[PDB]
Structure 1
Amino acid sequence: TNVETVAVAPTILRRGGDWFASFGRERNSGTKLFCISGNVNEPCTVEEEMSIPLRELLEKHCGGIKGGWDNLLGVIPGGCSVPILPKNICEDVLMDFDALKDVQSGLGTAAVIVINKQQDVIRAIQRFAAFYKHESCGQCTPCREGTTWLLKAMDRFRTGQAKEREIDMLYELTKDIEGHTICALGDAAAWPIQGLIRNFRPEMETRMKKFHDEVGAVSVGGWMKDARVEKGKVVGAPLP
């Protein structure tokens, strides 16, 4: 068990169980350390009650968002391993287990990494997929062979060498890793890609059409048709 949940143990043994149970909701009860980071004006870590609205988390104790409330592109409650909340519904949201898993997402450890609008989300999620490829232990075949393919598709989608169906395909191969592994690193690596495809699909297709008439058109797998294999290397493509 975690370092926090036994560091809280003598306090709640002393104060009693129902003084702890007063805070939060019916099954979501008590306190939590919140570490709010990313693109806040004031990054800091709080100790605050569960079941709390995210707007009066980010504005009450964090200064505000860098650029105000309309400068919110998205938000990650918890660590790397839960999907994005887009801006539309994360005004209404509570930070317990209940009001995040009905928003298809997790509390996790309640790290809150908010996303600047002037920053790119697909660069961030390419970085997340590179984290999961580096940190995978490599034992079972779907996680180990999946994180490498997730990285190879996310670099390609970051610059944009793709067809508009391959995002579709990307969803499919996160569904492949999702529940077939030993530990939960496989569905940890599945989830941020799923949140990206659910919440920022036109964000990806804008970058893809930007590629499509800055450069010529592209086949499946990132191949262009001047792209050929000469001695050693691959030429013709800028190889993401």
Structure 2
Amino acid sequence: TNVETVAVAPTILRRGGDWFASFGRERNSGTKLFCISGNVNEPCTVEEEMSIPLRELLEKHCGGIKGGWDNLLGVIPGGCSVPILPKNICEDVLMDFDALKDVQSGLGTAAVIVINKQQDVIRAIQRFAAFYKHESCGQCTPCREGTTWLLKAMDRFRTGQAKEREIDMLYELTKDIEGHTICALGDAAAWPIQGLIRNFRPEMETRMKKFHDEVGAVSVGGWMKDARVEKGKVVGAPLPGVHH
């Protein structure tokens, strides 16, 4: 059990259950501790009732969004293991399990990560990919190999060293992990890339056009015309993400 799930319990037994059910919608009862972080004006941990609207949590218990509401790009309402939400949804969405599942997302650990328009959302998602690569236990095949593959692809989509059909390829890669695992870390590694591809695809296409214009053409896998194996290394093109 979670710390919160047991810590509250004495108060629910003392104060009487129906009290705890007095909050939230029918099947989403209770209070909930929300940590709001990122590009919000005053990052905070608060305790509000369930099914609170997201706009209300951000504006009344935090400083609102840094630069105004319409300077919002997206909100991740349940931590890294949940797909991002675009601005169109966050205006009238309630912070619950049911609604957030109704918009193809989830209420996870009630951690709201806010992103501005000045930020690179692709960098956020590729950092979550790197996180799930570093944190894979290394047991079962799809997470083992696919977190690495997803990071390798997202490192390239950050710089635009890819093609437009490789986005659909990446979606299929996430589906190669999303149910063929022992634990749910593979699903948590598949879901954010799905959210990005669902809501922020033209940004990716724009980055790839920028690369095609500023550097040169590209093939499947990030290869260029001049890219060759010369003396133990690939020399004729950039290699994203390699730091060792």
User: TM-score band (shorter)?
Assistant: over 0.9
**Partner SS state of residue 142, structure 2:** helix
The answer for the alignment partner of 1:145 in structure 2 is 145
Could you list the per-position Cα deviations for residues 126-178 of structure 1 after superposition, in whole angstroms to 9, with x for gaps in the alignment? Answer: 10000000000000001111100000000011011111100010001101100
The 2-side partners of 1:210 and 1:152 are apart by: 19
Q: Which residue of 2 aligns with 1:100?
A: 100
In the TM superposition, residue 61 of structure 1 has moved relative to its aligned partner by 1.0
CA distance in 2, matches of 1:20, 1:105: 25
Offset at residue 183 of structure 1 (A): 0.5
Return the offset for 1:40: 0.4
**CA drift at 1:213:** 0.6
Stretches (4+) displaced over 6 A: none
CA offsets, 1:192-226, max 9 Å, x none? 00000000000100000000110110010000010
Once residues 34 and 79 of structure 2 are traced to their aligned partners in structure 1, the CA distance between those partners, rounded to angstroms, is: 11
- For 1:126 and 1:27, the matched residues in 2 are separated by 34
Question: What is the deviation of 1:116?
Answer: 1.0
Equivalence map 1:40-189=2 (5 Å):
40-189=40-189
- Gaps spanning 5+ residues in structure 1: where? none
Specify the SS of the correspondent of 2:47.
strand
Q: What is the deviation of 1:82?
A: 0.3
Query: Structure 2 regions of 5+ residues with no counterpart?
Result: none
State the alpha-carbon separation in 1 of the partners of residues 148 and 215 from structure 2: 26
What secondary structure does 1:112 align onto?
strand
Alpha-carbon RMSD across the aligned residues, in angstroms, is: 0.5
2 CA distance for matches of 1:69 and 1:214?
33
Residue 59 of structure 1, CA deviation: 0.4
Deviation at 1:79, TM superposition (A): 1.1
Aligned residues between the structures: 240
Q: What is the distance in 1 between the residues matched to 2:6 and 2:61?
A: 26
Task: Give the superposition deviation at 1:64.
Answer: 1.3
- 3-state SS of 2:165 partner: helix
Q: Specify the SS of the correspondent of 2:53.
A: coil
Rounded to whole Å, the distance in 2 between the matches of 1:189 and 1:26 is: 31
Task: Give 1:33 shift.
Answer: 0.2
**Partner SS state of residue 73, structure 1:** strand
Where does residue 3 of structure 2 map in the other structure?
3
Deviations 1:63-121 (A, max 9, x none): 11100101100000011100010001110100000110010000001100010110000
SS at match of 2:149: helix
In structure 2, how many angstroms separate the alpha carbons of the residues matched to 1:56 and 1:22?
19
SS at match of 2:94: coil
Q: Percent identity?
A: 100
CA shift for structure 1 position 238: 1.1
